[PDB]
Amino acid sequence: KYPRRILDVYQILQSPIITEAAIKNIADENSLLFTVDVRADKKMIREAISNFFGVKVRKVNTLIRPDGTKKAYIMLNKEYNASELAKKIGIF
Amino acid sequence: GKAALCLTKRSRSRKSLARTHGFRLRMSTTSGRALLKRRRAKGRKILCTKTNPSSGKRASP
Amino acid sequence: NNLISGQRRCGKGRNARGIITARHRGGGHKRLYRKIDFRRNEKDIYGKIVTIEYDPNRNAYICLIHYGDGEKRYILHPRGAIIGDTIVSGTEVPIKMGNALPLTDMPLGTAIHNIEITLGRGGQLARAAGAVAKLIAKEGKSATLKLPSGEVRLISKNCSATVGQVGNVGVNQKRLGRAGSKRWLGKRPVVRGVVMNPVDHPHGGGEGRAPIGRKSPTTPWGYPALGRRSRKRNKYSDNFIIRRRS
RNA sequence: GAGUUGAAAAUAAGCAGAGAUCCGGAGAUUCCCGAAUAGGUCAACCUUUCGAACUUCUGCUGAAUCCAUGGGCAGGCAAGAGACAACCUGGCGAACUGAAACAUCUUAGUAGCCAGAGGAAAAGAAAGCAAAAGCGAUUCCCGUAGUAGCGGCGAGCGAA
RNA sequence: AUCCCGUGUGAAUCAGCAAGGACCACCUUGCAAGGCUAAAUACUCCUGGGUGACCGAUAGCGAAGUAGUACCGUGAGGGA
RNA sequence: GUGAAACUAAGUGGAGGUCCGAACCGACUGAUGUUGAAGAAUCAGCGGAUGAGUUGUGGUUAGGGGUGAAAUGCCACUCG
RNA sequence: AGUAACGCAAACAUUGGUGAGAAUCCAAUGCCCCGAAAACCUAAGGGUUCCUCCGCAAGGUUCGUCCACGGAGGGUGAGUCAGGGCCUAAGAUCAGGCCGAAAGGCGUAGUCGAUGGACAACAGGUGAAUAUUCCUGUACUACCCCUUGUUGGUCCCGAGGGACGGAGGAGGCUAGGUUAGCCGAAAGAUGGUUAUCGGUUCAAGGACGCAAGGUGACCCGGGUAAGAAGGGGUAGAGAAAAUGCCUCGAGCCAAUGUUCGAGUACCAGGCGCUACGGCGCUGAAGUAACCGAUGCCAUACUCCCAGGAAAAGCUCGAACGACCUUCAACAAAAGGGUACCUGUACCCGAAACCGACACAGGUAGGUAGGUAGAGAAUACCUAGGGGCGCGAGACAACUCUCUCUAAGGAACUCGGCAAAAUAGCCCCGUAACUUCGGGAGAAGGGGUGCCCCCUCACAAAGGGGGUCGAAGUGACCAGGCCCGGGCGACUGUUUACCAAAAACACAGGUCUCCGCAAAGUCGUAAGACCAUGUAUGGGGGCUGACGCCUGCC
RNA sequence: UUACUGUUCCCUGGGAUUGGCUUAUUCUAACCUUGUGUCAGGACCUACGGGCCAAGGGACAUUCU
Ligand SMILES: [Mg+2]
Ligand SMILES: [Mg+2]
Ligand SMILES: [Mg+2]
Ligand SMILES: [Mg+2]
Ligand SMILES: [Mg+2]
Ligand SMILES: [Mg+2]
Ligand SMILES: [Mg+2]
Ligand SMILES: [Mg+2]
Ligand SMILES: [Mg+2]
Ligand SMILES: [Mg+2]
Ligand SMILES: [Mg+2]
Ligand SMILES: [Mg+2]
Ligand SMILES: [Mg+2]
Ligand SMILES: [Mg+2]
Ligand SMILES: [Mg+2]
Ligand SMILES: [Mg+2]
Ligand SMILES: [Mg+2]
Ligand SMILES: [Mg+2]
Ligand SMILES: [Mg+2]
Ligand SMILES: [Mg+2]
Ligand SMILES: [Mg+2]
Ligand SMILES: [Mg+2]
Ligand SMILES: [Mg+2]
Ligand SMILES: [Mg+2]
Ligand SMILES: [Mg+2]
Ligand SMILES: [Mg+2]
Ligand SMILES: [Mg+2]
Ligand SMILES: [Mg+2]
Ligand SMILES: [Mg+2]
Ligand SMILES: [Mg+2]
Ligand SMILES: [Mg+2]
Ligand SMILES: [Mg+2]
Ligand SMILES: [Mg+2]
Ligand SMILES: [Mg+2]
Ligand SMILES: [Mg+2]
Ligand SMILES: [Mg+2]
Ligand SMILES: [Mg+2]
Ligand SMILES: [Mg+2]
Ligand SMILES: [Mg+2]
Ligand SMILES: [Mg+2]
Ligand SMILES: [Mg+2]
Ligand SMILES: [Mg+2]
Ligand SMILES: [Mg+2]
Ligand SMILES: [Mg+2]
Ligand SMILES: [Mg+2]
Ligand SMILES: [Mg+2]
Ligand SMILES: [Mg+2]
Ligand SMILES: [Mg+2]
Ligand SMILES: [Mg+2]
Ligand SMILES: [Mg+2]
Ligand SMILES: [Mg+2]
Ligand SMILES: [Mg+2]
Ligand SMILES: [Mg+2]
Ligand SMILES: [Mg+2]
Ligand SMILES: [Mg+2]
Ligand SMILES: [Mg+2]
Ligand SMILES: [Mg+2]
Ligand SMILES: [Mg+2]
Ligand SMILES: [Mg+2]
Ligand SMILES: [Mg+2]
Ligand SMILES: [Mg+2]
Ligand SMILES: [Mg+2]
Ligand SMILES: [Mg+2]
Ligand SMILES: [Mg+2]
Ligand SMILES: [Mg+2]
Ligand SMILES: [Mg+2]
Ligand SMILES: [Mg+2]
Ligand SMILES: [Mg+2]
Ligand SMILES: [Mg+2]
Ligand SMILES: [Mg+2]
Ligand SMILES: [Mg+2]
Ligand SMILES: [Mg+2]
Ligand SMILES: [Mg+2]
Ligand SMILES: [Mg+2]
Ligand SMILES: [Mg+2]
Ligand SMILES: [Mg+2]
Ligand SMILES: [Mg+2]
Ligand SMILES: [Mg+2]
Ligand SMILES: [Mg+2]
Ligand SMILES: [Mg+2]
Ligand SMILES: [Mg+2]
Ligand SMILES: [Mg+2]
């Protein structure tokens, strides 16, 4: 019942990434890029996106940068579309 | 195939050096607790040079 | 097989401090520890011999025992033993080799080994290869006997012991052909003090092959090396001694 | 009491005589390591039953063993821990040096190490000084005095 | 002598005990073997105010700039 | 072969601090270098190379000391 | 002093382009080097050096338009890889407990602690920089749900198992390699010629199963009664286990292999496009024999003495004790669903680690091609990576690194220092001495190429004949030997950085101490080592194989 | 080192720890040693250890002065 750690769930997602490679990844993989907290997990991020936008998450992959900042690859299920969700935010 | 006489630092792993010169090693004995007292009054930035965490980019494994 | 284990005191010669007390110990081949039964408890049950195994932790062989209750034990190997012989530990046991019983029920002039000095500690004396202790006489409280060193000690009567002589008597006959066989046992090279420097041994200095140059030969710690008897005067076991070895 | 959102301009948006910014008093929050104290650990991390560990306090239960002891359970923003330049108290306790050497002696009960505690500490309310006359706890300064003395009667040490 | 300890022995209660530089006698003084106690006194990592026959960038705190930084050392530590 | 053994001829077997010789570990001679490319190396030969072998990783022994197949040698280019 | 040097003697050269500017940057062609690496991964370590754009102050031992430099931005994707969430060794800590001026020391269970054990994935593709991590396809592990059944389970506890050495060689396979065949393409201006060039490939995993291999009692092929692997039953303190007894059982062991995975996927080549990047279609054949591992079966077997970790996971099972419960728990097949933390960049036989340097150095482990060859030596090459970060001329002495040198051959010299010579394989022949093992490759001589035949090639070797050269192990590679003496027996160890020895050690021999609460050793003490050993053992002194001896006071 | 002065290991005596009956020997109760003997908590201690009961020594020795 307990999570791994305890902190602000609304801080798990700071902001997305806007790069020519990231935008290229949305159309090919149906994925999304998000900078995340260092203390975050794949479970909290999976639960997070399920609540904000109301969409299913096929898989989550993460990594820690050299600067101590964690990044999160989020692949949505094929039923939904990351490009459609992208336009809802404002970024293409 | 013989190393020169001055090679005293053979690039040993940081895991073993922390077990010999790390923060936890100093706080065990009374002398190490006084060692840090000298380096704090000195005002040194890095109190223990030979130390590393158990995880992260610094982890030896 | 379950009596063998690898839990031993590694770091031979080194004490808790980690300094060398018993010198010239190190190297050598690895060896597991065998659990030998010296108390010889579980009395009044027959057990036969099946194997005659090699024990690296001693000079003598051992013998596996199989009792009717399924238990298994190790014991020393007597001299004329053969596979199938039985052994018993008790009081009214017949006086033959391999059996164990107190000294009260033994006759005079018996070949005895695996003697215990106190009840419960188990046998301590006459364990080595070809060892034997001859029972001379008994008188009331205690019983005197002879040891392999030739000394006549006075042991209590209620102490247990095993009959016969220990196996593999012919082990001195082979000479270690070379130095490598010595290092395999875990015995490092012995250096002579007369070759050392004066700071290391009292015999050290002097050009050429120096003589002793001292009133007597001395240990590395100053005391003499010949003649001085090291037995503690007024020892607790001083009355149990009948004579000195020879 | 009129302009402001640090150093630190610029940019983008705000607050403000319905009295901001700013200045004081009392409070709140105060992530991780660290006495670190849920457990572990290569300090700032990990695993977690999610817990101030242990000693003390308040209760309940009551091994060998009758009373007890030791354990066990629970309660309790729950007393203590650690840090702290020097001075102070206690414990251990040098050597070079001086004596034109050196051991008695001196350097010195100094240095340094350990422990503890306070704004001061320690000492302290006569089984005391004194000498035929008298003083009336302890501490500090002047002076007695480099005097009386101590000392291989040497170096030097030194009162009341 | 006075004061304080280890070992071993071991008193007396005001008709008494200790001290007064071995000790005895007389006299004087004092009442051990329980404890607490402010002030005058010593110190400055610091705080506020004030003053310098103190320095003025090789000086003055090691350091008037991201100074115990850079750099060196396994480390203690040294150190612009 | 003998009374039985001792002894003895072949074959099998593949022992050894065995032999030659790379890696690996060592460092005997000479040259070169000697403000060196290098605070002990390069080049040409040399020794051991199934053993008392070599080596990694993780550890132990700390100075009136430790360690030493013992040179007063080694113990962070530092050791009477 | 504008002096020495600019870090190996693997080697550069031309054309064209970029640009203010080119021996130094980019591309092309040719030449040359490494190729048990100077190649590709990878551990530690370093800590953004990795990629793109811009720039050239400083840094680079020259130049510089370039860079491991500077500035800006970007980059490391895991249920299966590695580590942790599991276990434990060495060793470090240690509840209580013992000891001790203080600090603290000793120490029991317990807990930490990989260099080990345990545990589930491959191929292909994508590509500014990452992928066993993303995409495709095919699998695996754990948990949950679902469907029946069972209906007491889960810990503690007991037992099994895990569980282990070295050396040696044989056998059965595969990787890999070569050749042949098949397919496709080719005229490479020469005397001739296709005899030339290229391709001929694919995993984890699932399912099946094996000898003429190894093993398993019975005979000189057959017969026969116990007997292997692997099971069952029974008695006693007695569930399992162990021990004893009885009984079934000719088959077992596993690398390899068959099939699916495995598609016209991959692929030579061909057809068209171009900004020349690759894109888009097309895409044949995809077999066999020989050689053969240092790798697999394999802790398979044999022999030997020095006698070759622990714990957990896993499996079996009673009682006592503890916790929980009629599913809410255990257990079986299919199907479906779900899926923690950290590392992942780049260099790594190095210009990025360690050596103060972009230093002729040191740095564990993995992969191991072709010709000759015993070979991972050596020589030349493939894949792939490089031409060594100052150069151009000139061609004095002198120095260093190398080659040859007439006649003589150690006359040199402290000294045959150094150099030269010897060298392989197959035959012949091998002394004194000896501890009978050796000496010994003793020494010293002969042969060695290529072609044909004998010959059946019998894998060889041998014989006969013929032929070329001054020279046939023609290169690289690759022992110099003999006589005598001193010391030490021998293999080995030693003054890291002037001494490798006659010194040390050594097997053996001798003396003396120690009866276990041992002597001895370290500690203030508790205690530890000696030793989980017991006088055929342990400590200490001297001597130093073996042989003859070891006197007198 | 058979230089001077000292320290330590070790040996020996007096005293304490320390007692009883006999003519120095014995006795057991202090003290020393041992137990895979036994009991013990939620559980284990066959993991040191603790309590109990035994065994061997015995007023010696260890320890302090
Ligand atoms: Mg990850
Ligand atoms: Mg090496
Ligand atoms: Mg010498
Ligand atoms: Mg001496
Ligand atoms: Mg001498
Ligand atoms: Mg002489
Ligand atoms: Mg904690
Ligand atoms: Mg802690
Ligand atoms: Mg408090
Ligand atoms: Mg404190
Ligand atoms: Mg002095
Ligand atoms: Mg003097
Ligand atoms: Mg003087
Ligand atoms: Mg204070
Ligand atoms: Mg005040
Ligand atoms: Mg005051
Ligand atoms: Mg006070
Ligand atoms: Mg007071
Ligand atoms: Mg007095
Ligand atoms: Mg007087
Ligand atoms: Mg008085
Ligand atoms: Mg200054
Ligand atoms: Mg000026
Ligand atoms: Mg050899
Ligand atoms: Mg060789
Ligand atoms: Mg050497
Ligand atoms: Mg060489
Ligand atoms: Mg060689
Ligand atoms: Mg040779
Ligand atoms: Mg040799
Ligand atoms: Mg130390
Ligand atoms: Mg010192
Ligand atoms: Mg040195
Ligand atoms: Mg000149
Ligand atoms: Mg010149
Ligand atoms: Mg130079
Ligand atoms: Mg020049
Ligand atoms: Mg070459
Ligand atoms: Mg780059
Ligand atoms: Mg420039
Ligand atoms: Mg330049
Ligand atoms: Mg850059
Ligand atoms: Mg794994
Ligand atoms: Mg404690
Ligand atoms: Mg322990
Ligand atoms: Mg553990
Ligand atoms: Mg590991
Ligand atoms: Mg794991
Ligand atoms: Mg890459
Ligand atoms: Mg087993
Ligand atoms: Mg032609
Ligand atoms: Mg049964
Ligand atoms: Mg990667
Ligand atoms: Mg990579
Ligand atoms: Mg390497
Ligand atoms: Mg290199
Ligand atoms: Mg250097
Ligand atoms: Mg090859
Ligand atoms: Mg080669
Ligand atoms: Mg080549
Ligand atoms: Mg060049
Ligand atoms: Mg270079
Ligand atoms: Mg160069
Ligand atoms: Mg000539
Ligand atoms: Mg001459
Ligand atoms: Mg001459
Ligand atoms: Mg020569
Ligand atoms: Mg030559
Ligand atoms: Mg020959
Ligand atoms: Mg000869
Ligand atoms: Mg040669
Ligand atoms: Mg001569
Ligand atoms: Mg020799
Ligand atoms: Mg040699
Ligand atoms: Mg040398
Ligand atoms: Mg040599
Ligand atoms: Mg030399
Ligand atoms: Mg030597
Ligand atoms: Mg002892
Ligand atoms: Mg000798
Ligand atoms: Mg008991
Ligand atoms: Mg017990």
PDB file of N, CA and C (backbone and C1' of nucleotides) in Angstrom, chain B residues 15 18-19 22-24 27 37 51-55 61, chain D residues 33-35 41-46 83-85 114-115:
ATOM      1  N   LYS B  15      35.624   2.094  -3.982  1.00  0.00           N
ATOM      2  CA  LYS B  15      34.902   1.368  -2.943  1.00  0.00           C
ATOM      3  C   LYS B  15      35.824   1.026  -1.781  1.00  0.00           C
ATOM      4  N   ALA B  18      37.061   4.242   0.204  1.00  0.00           N
ATOM      5  CA  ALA B  18      36.075   4.768   1.139  1.00  0.00           C
ATOM      6  C   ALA B  18      36.041   3.941   2.415  1.00  0.00           C
ATOM      7  N   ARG B  19      36.247   2.630   2.295  1.00  0.00           N
ATOM      8  CA  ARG B  19      36.326   1.766   3.463  1.00  0.00           C
ATOM      9  C   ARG B  19      37.608   1.966   4.261  1.00  0.00           C
ATOM     10  N   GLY B  22      37.055   6.878   4.292  1.00  0.00           N
ATOM     11  CA  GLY B  22      35.763   7.498   4.094  1.00  0.00           C
ATOM     12  C   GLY B  22      35.216   8.165   5.338  1.00  0.00           C
ATOM     13  N   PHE B  23      34.036   8.763   5.169  1.00  0.00           N
ATOM     14  CA  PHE B  23      33.407   9.502   6.257  1.00  0.00           C
ATOM     15  C   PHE B  23      33.011   8.579   7.400  1.00  0.00           C
ATOM     16  N   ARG B  24      32.434   7.421   7.077  1.00  0.00           N
ATOM     17  CA  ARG B  24      32.020   6.486   8.115  1.00  0.00           C
ATOM     18  C   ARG B  24      33.213   5.950   8.893  1.00  0.00           C
ATOM     19  N   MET B  27      34.275   8.697  11.604  1.00  0.00           N
ATOM     20  CA  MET B  27      33.338   8.857  12.706  1.00  0.00           C
ATOM     21  C   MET B  27      33.317   7.665  13.655  1.00  0.00           C
ATOM     22  N   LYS B  37      37.158  17.765  13.300  1.00  0.00           N
ATOM     23  CA  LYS B  37      37.167  18.995  14.081  1.00  0.00           C
ATOM     24  C   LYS B  37      38.286  19.921  13.627  1.00  0.00           C
ATOM     25  N   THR B  51      35.951   9.598  -0.560  1.00  0.00           N
ATOM     26  CA  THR B  51      34.617   9.161  -0.188  1.00  0.00           C
ATOM     27  C   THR B  51      33.748   9.138  -1.435  1.00  0.00           C
ATOM     28  N   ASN B  52      32.788   8.221  -1.452  1.00  0.00           N
ATOM     29  CA  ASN B  52      31.858   8.098  -2.562  1.00  0.00           C
ATOM     30  C   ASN B  52      30.544   7.545  -2.033  1.00  0.00           C
ATOM     31  N   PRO B  53      29.436   7.786  -2.726  1.00  0.00           N
ATOM     32  CA  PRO B  53      28.154   7.228  -2.298  1.00  0.00           C
ATOM     33  C   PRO B  53      28.060   5.748  -2.647  1.00  0.00           C
ATOM     34  N   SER B  54      26.947   5.144  -2.240  1.00  0.00           N
ATOM     35  CA  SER B  54      26.637   3.764  -2.577  1.00  0.00           C
ATOM     36  C   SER B  54      25.915   3.624  -3.910  1.00  0.00           C
ATOM     37  N   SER B  55      25.503   4.729  -4.528  1.00  0.00           N
ATOM     38  CA  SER B  55      24.772   4.681  -5.784  1.00  0.00           C
ATOM     39  C   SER B  55      25.056   5.952  -6.570  1.00  0.00           C
ATOM     40  N   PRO B  61      30.681   0.079  -8.532  1.00  0.00           N
ATOM     41  CA  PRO B  61      30.088  -0.985  -9.353  1.00  0.00           C
ATOM     42  C   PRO B  61      29.351  -0.450 -10.578  1.00  0.00           C
TER      43      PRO B  61
ATOM     44  P     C D  33      18.654  11.204   5.728  1.00  0.00           P
ATOM     45  O5'   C D  33      20.206  11.561   5.746  1.00  0.00           O
ATOM     46  C5'   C D  33      21.114  10.856   4.915  1.00  0.00           C
ATOM     47  C4'   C D  33      22.494  11.463   4.943  1.00  0.00           C
ATOM     48  C3'   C D  33      23.166  11.562   6.301  1.00  0.00           C
ATOM     49  O3'   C D  33      23.754  10.341   6.716  1.00  0.00           O
ATOM     50  C1'   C D  33      23.453  13.590   5.110  1.00  0.00           C
ATOM     51  P     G D  34      23.750   9.922   8.266  1.00  0.00           P
ATOM     52  O5'   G D  34      24.476  11.131   9.005  1.00  0.00           O
ATOM     53  C5'   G D  34      25.888  11.278   8.965  1.00  0.00           C
ATOM     54  C4'   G D  34      26.324  12.580   9.588  1.00  0.00           C
ATOM     55  C3'   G D  34      25.999  12.746  11.065  1.00  0.00           C
ATOM     56  O3'   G D  34      26.997  12.184  11.902  1.00  0.00           O
ATOM     57  C1'   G D  34      25.297  14.669   9.871  1.00  0.00           C
ATOM     58  P     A D  35      26.793  10.747  12.590  1.00  0.00           P
ATOM     59  O5'   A D  35      26.937  11.053  14.144  1.00  0.00           O
ATOM     60  C5'   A D  35      26.433  12.261  14.689  1.00  0.00           C
ATOM     61  C4'   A D  35      26.297  12.183  16.187  1.00  0.00           C
ATOM     62  C3'   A D  35      25.410  11.070  16.718  1.00  0.00           C
ATOM     63  O3'   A D  35      26.069   9.816  16.768  1.00  0.00           O
ATOM     64  C1'   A D  35      24.844  13.096  17.785  1.00  0.00           C
ATOM     65  P     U D  41      25.759  -1.908   8.085  1.00  0.00           P
ATOM     66  O5'   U D  41      25.996  -0.933   6.848  1.00  0.00           O
ATOM     67  C5'   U D  41      26.209  -1.451   5.544  1.00  0.00           C
ATOM     68  C4'   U D  41      26.222  -0.362   4.502  1.00  0.00           C
ATOM     69  C3'   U D  41      27.279   0.714   4.685  1.00  0.00           C
ATOM     70  O3'   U D  41      28.541   0.321   4.179  1.00  0.00           O
ATOM     71  C1'   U D  41      25.185   1.724   4.243  1.00  0.00           C
ATOM     72  P     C D  42      29.891   0.972   4.755  1.00  0.00           P
ATOM     73  O5'   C D  42      30.433   1.858   3.550  1.00  0.00           O
ATOM     74  C5'   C D  42      31.756   2.377   3.574  1.00  0.00           C
ATOM     75  C4'   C D  42      31.987   3.384   2.476  1.00  0.00           C
ATOM     76  C3'   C D  42      30.879   4.419   2.297  1.00  0.00           C
ATOM     77  O3'   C D  42      31.446   5.677   1.938  1.00  0.00           O
ATOM     78  C1'   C D  42      31.174   3.225   0.283  1.00  0.00           C
ATOM     79  P     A D  43      31.897   6.708   3.083  1.00  0.00           P
ATOM     80  O5'   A D  43      30.530   7.364   3.568  1.00  0.00           O
ATOM     81  C5'   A D  43      29.720   8.101   2.666  1.00  0.00           C
ATOM     82  C4'   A D  43      28.546   8.732   3.368  1.00  0.00           C
ATOM     83  C3'   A D  43      27.663   9.627   2.512  1.00  0.00           C
ATOM     84  O3'   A D  43      26.704   8.887   1.776  1.00  0.00           O
ATOM     85  C1'   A D  43      28.166  10.713   4.558  1.00  0.00           C
ATOM     86  P     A D  44      26.429   9.210   0.227  1.00  0.00           P
ATOM     87  O5'   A D  44      25.357  10.384   0.259  1.00  0.00           O
ATOM     88  C5'   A D  44      24.075  10.187   0.833  1.00  0.00           C
ATOM     89  C4'   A D  44      23.376  11.503   1.047  1.00  0.00           C
ATOM     90  C3'   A D  44      23.162  12.334  -0.209  1.00  0.00           C
ATOM     91  O3'   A D  44      21.972  11.981  -0.892  1.00  0.00           O
ATOM     92  C1'   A D  44      24.152  13.675   1.468  1.00  0.00           C
ATOM     93  P     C D  45      21.866  12.091  -2.492  1.00  0.00           P
ATOM     94  O5'   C D  45      21.764  10.575  -2.964  1.00  0.00           O
ATOM     95  C5'   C D  45      20.719   9.738  -2.497  1.00  0.00           C
ATOM     96  C4'   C D  45      21.155   8.297  -2.430  1.00  0.00           C
ATOM     97  C3'   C D  45      20.059   7.274  -2.193  1.00  0.00           C
ATOM     98  O3'   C D  45      19.319   6.961  -3.358  1.00  0.00           O
ATOM     99  C1'   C D  45      21.865   6.817  -0.755  1.00  0.00           C
ATOM    100  P     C D  46      17.802   6.448  -3.227  1.00  0.00           P
ATOM    101  O5'   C D  46      17.952   4.965  -2.670  1.00  0.00           O
ATOM    102  C5'   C D  46      18.651   3.987  -3.420  1.00  0.00           C
ATOM    103  C4'   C D  46      18.798   2.693  -2.659  1.00  0.00           C
ATOM    104  C3'   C D  46      17.517   2.079  -2.127  1.00  0.00           C
ATOM    105  O3'   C D  46      16.770   1.400  -3.120  1.00  0.00           O
ATOM    106  C1'   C D  46      19.169   2.023  -0.446  1.00  0.00           C
ATOM    107  P     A D  83      31.260  15.891  20.023  1.00  0.00           P
ATOM    108  O5'   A D  83      30.854  17.351  19.535  1.00  0.00           O
ATOM    109  C5'   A D  83      30.686  17.629  18.154  1.00  0.00           C
ATOM    110  C4'   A D  83      30.130  19.012  17.922  1.00  0.00           C
ATOM    111  C3'   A D  83      30.976  20.170  18.421  1.00  0.00           C
ATOM    112  O3'   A D  83      32.032  20.503  17.540  1.00  0.00           O
ATOM    113  C1'   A D  83      28.735  20.497  19.081  1.00  0.00           C
ATOM    114  P     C D  84      33.462  20.938  18.126  1.00  0.00           P
ATOM    115  O5'   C D  84      33.140  22.204  19.033  1.00  0.00           O
ATOM    116  C5'   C D  84      32.738  23.430  18.445  1.00  0.00           C
ATOM    117  C4'   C D  84      32.465  24.486  19.486  1.00  0.00           C
ATOM    118  C3'   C D  84      33.581  24.743  20.484  1.00  0.00           C
ATOM    119  O3'   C D  84      34.598  25.585  19.973  1.00  0.00           O
ATOM    120  C1'   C D  84      31.530  24.545  21.634  1.00  0.00           C
ATOM    121  P     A D  85      36.111  25.056  19.880  1.00  0.00           P
ATOM    122  O5'   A D  85      36.978  26.391  19.870  1.00  0.00           O
ATOM    123  C5'   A D  85      38.175  26.478  19.114  1.00  0.00           C
ATOM    124  C4'   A D  85      38.898  27.770  19.390  1.00  0.00           C
ATOM    125  C3'   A D  85      39.491  27.905  20.784  1.00  0.00           C
ATOM    126  O3'   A D  85      40.764  27.293  20.898  1.00  0.00           O
ATOM    127  C1'   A D  85      38.240  29.839  20.278  1.00  0.00           C
ATOM    128  P     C D 114      42.085  14.179  22.274  1.00  0.00           P
ATOM    129  O5'   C D 114      41.520  13.405  23.543  1.00  0.00           O
ATOM    130  C5'   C D 114      41.520  11.987  23.575  1.00  0.00           C
ATOM    131  C4'   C D 114      41.119  11.453  24.925  1.00  0.00           C
ATOM    132  C3'   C D 114      39.847  12.027  25.522  1.00  0.00           C
ATOM    133  O3'   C D 114      38.670  11.467  24.972  1.00  0.00           O
ATOM    134  C1'   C D 114      41.531  11.977  27.170  1.00  0.00           C
ATOM    135  P     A D 115      37.357  12.375  24.805  1.00  0.00           P
ATOM    136  O5'   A D 115      36.856  12.588  26.301  1.00  0.00           O
ATOM    137  C5'   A D 115      36.520  11.472  27.106  1.00  0.00           C
ATOM    138  C4'   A D 115      36.237  11.869  28.533  1.00  0.00           C
ATOM    139  C3'   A D 115      35.284  13.035  28.731  1.00  0.00           C
ATOM    140  O3'   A D 115      33.923  12.680  28.577  1.00  0.00           O
ATOM    141  C1'   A D 115      37.158  13.304  30.138  1.00  0.00           C
TER     142        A D 115
END
